[PDB]
Amino acid sequence: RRGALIVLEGVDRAGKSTQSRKLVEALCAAGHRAELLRFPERSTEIGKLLSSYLQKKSDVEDHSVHLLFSANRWEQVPLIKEKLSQGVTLVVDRYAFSGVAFTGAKENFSLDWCKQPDVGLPKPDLVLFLQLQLADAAKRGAFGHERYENGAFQERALRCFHQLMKDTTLNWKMVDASKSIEAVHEDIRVLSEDAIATATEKPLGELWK
Ligand SMILES: Nc1ncnc2c1ncn2[C@@H]1O[C@H](COP(=O)(O)OP(=O)(O)NP(=O)(O)O)[C@@H](O)[C@H]1O
Ligand SMILES: Cc1cn([C@H]2C[C@H](F)[C@@H](COP(=O)(O)O)O2)c(=O)[nH]c1=O
Ligand SMILES: [Mg+2]
Ligand SMILES: [Mg+2]
């Protein structure tokens, strides 16, 4: 009985990391085997190159960095498939959708070109998108020093996310991330329990193919 692959995507400061941590904790407390992943995974050799880029400690050509972000997912595919096959549900803080939306926000990058490197990855059984109005986000801190942490760029990435949500091959669920941490958590947790039950029924799919 395989585990489910659950991805959290969402606007800046919408609560992806908070909700991913809370979801794994709740699932494990309810008797499931669940583990947390995040992308980029900065611990690998590729992940270190990505972390330096995001911190502005290095500059990387736009196409090359897009491909590093995708390679950083592929290097974890053997682990992802092993865990799901062993019955472990994986909760993932960002995935290929962020990969496409962030590079796709740059000039002269088509969504098609951006998707291709990730074609074939393990397909999420559930893609949560944490929606939040900017007035409500603003109250969640201030733009930091990392790359991409600016309004105009975030807005272009959001438009790309909306283009990806048109894709009916995926199980997208919108989450109102403007509520309390606990209320958002309960909405996510219930959606996740449902997905876990059904994932044991169909084989793990392949993304965008
Ligand atoms: N529902 C919520 N209400 C209020 N504050 C929240 C909520 N969820 C998260 N926060 C806070 O807002 C900040 C950002 O939350 P976090 O879950 O880290 O965002 P994130 O979605 O991972 N952001 P990023 O990774 O930068 O795109 C943290 O200090 C959280 O404690
Ligand atoms: C997974 C992924 C994330 N992002 C961006 C979005 C964001 F600025 C950053 C990750 O920030 P944290 O790792 O601190 O969550 O990297 C991309 O541009 N491409 C990707 O493939
Ligand atoms: Mg985060
Ligand atoms: Mg093609």
**In CATH, what number is assigned to the domain containing residue 6?**
3.40.50.300
Kindly report each contact of residues 26-30 with a partner whose C-beta sits within 8 Å and lies 24 or more positions away, as own/partner: 26/185, 26/189, 27/89, 27/91, 27/189, 27/192, 27/193, 27/196, 30/193
Domains contained in the chain, number = 1
* Ligand 2 center–CA 30 separation, angstroms: 30
Q: Is the dihedral of CA 76, 154, 17, 172 positive or negative?
A: negative
Count of CB atoms situated within 10 Å of the CB of 64: 11
C-alpha distances in angstroms, 182 versus 18, 42, 141, 187? 10, 28, 19, 9
Alpha-helix runs per DSSP H in the chain:
16-29, 45-54, 62-74, 77-85, 96-104, 111-115, 134-138, 151-164, 181-199
Q: Which of 7, 11, 17 has most ligand 1 atoms within 8 Å of its beta carbon, as the pocket-test mutant?
A: 17
CA distance 8 to 33: 18
Q: Is the dihedral of CA 66, 68, 73, 78 positive or negative?
A: positive
| Token output for 89 | 């549900």
Tell me if 140 CB under 6 Å of ligand 1. Answer: yes
**14 assigned ligand-binding residue:** yes
CA distance 106 to 174: 25
Resolution (A): 1.6
Question: Structural domain of residue 150, as residue ranges?
Answer: 1-209
**21 assigned ligand-binding residue:** no
Residue with tokens 């409500």: 136
Atom of ligand 1 nearest to the CA of 16: 21
Please report which ligand is nearest the Cα atom of 20.
1
Count of CB atoms situated within 10 Å of the CB of 76: 19
Element (H, E) at 140: none
Instruction: Cis check for the bond before 203: say yes or no (omega within 30 of 0).
Output: no
C-alpha distances in angstroms, 29 versus 92, 93, 150, 158, 189? 18, 20, 37, 34, 12
Tell me if 98 CB under 6 Å of ligand 2. Answer: yes
Look at residues 79, 15, 6 and name the one whose alpha carbon lies nearest to residue 43: 79
Classified as helix, coil or strand, 89 is: strand
| Closest residue CA from atom 29 of ligand 1 | 140
> What technique determined this structure?
X-ray
Listing from the earlier edge strand, what are the strands of the sheet with 5-10?
A: 34-38, 89-93, 5-10, 126-131, 172-176
How buried is 189 (Cβ within 10 angstroms: 0-12 exposed, 13-18 middle, 19+ buried)? middle
Element (H, E) at 130: strand 126-131
CA distance 196 to 2: 9
